[PDB]
Design a protein around this ligand. Structure first.
Ligand SMILES: [Fe+2]
Length: 187
């Protein structure tokens, strides 16, 4: 329950280990610390590996199996589908550029179009939080000129999240994969 400003991404990763030592998690302490790290591109550029057609997930640290810490690279116009988070804590800090998170309601079992609950446009260094009991979201880099990089930490770690047909609400199970791990590109 001691939180200092993390000098560096590596300092950040150490603090996050201390916070995730136990069984439970204090969601606001994790989020305060992410927001406290000033984005420093020289420290994370290794992991900012872009693909031209969709956003990539670059694993930075496995958190002794209590959380995945990854960085996501969004090419301008890249978006996720609408997804849940497998009953998990999900933190998203912007390291560069801007993303637009659109919050949706869990659809009812009718084949009816999901409609936006709210939206908000995250700017650099802000850290947002979502979990399944808040709703489904969809992050997008709607910029046409600038890429986005975001830092994200999920606990527990999960490989599979669901994708939601926006018109129907029908879900499909999707399996997350990694563009790189620890700076190393994994096909
Ligand atoms: Fe998400």
């Amino acid at each position: 329950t001691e939180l200092l400003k993390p000098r560096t991404l590596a300092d950040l990763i150490r603090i996050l280990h201390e916070l995730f030592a136990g069984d439970e998690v204090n969601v606001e302490e994790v989020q305060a610390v992410l927001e406290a790290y000033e984005s420093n591109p020289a420290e994370w550029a290794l992991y900012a590996k872009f693909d031209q057609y969709r956003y990539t997930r670059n694993l930075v640290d496995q958190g002794n199996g209590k959380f995945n810490l990854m960085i996501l690279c969004w090419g301008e116009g890249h978006g996720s589908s609408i997804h849940d988070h497998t009953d998990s804590h999900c933190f998203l800090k912007l390291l560069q550029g801007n993303l637009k998170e659109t919050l949706f309601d869990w659809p009812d079992k009718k084949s009816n179009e999901m409609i936006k609950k709210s939206e908000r446009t995250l700017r650099e260094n802000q850290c947002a939080y979502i979990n399944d009991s808040i709703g489904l979201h969809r992050v997008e880099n709607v910029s046409h000129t600038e890429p986005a990089v975001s830092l994200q930490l999920y606990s527990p770690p999960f490989d599979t999240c669901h994708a939601f047909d926006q018109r129907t609400g029908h879900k499909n199970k999707v399996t997350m994969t990694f563009h790189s791990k620890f700076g190393i590109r994994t096909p």
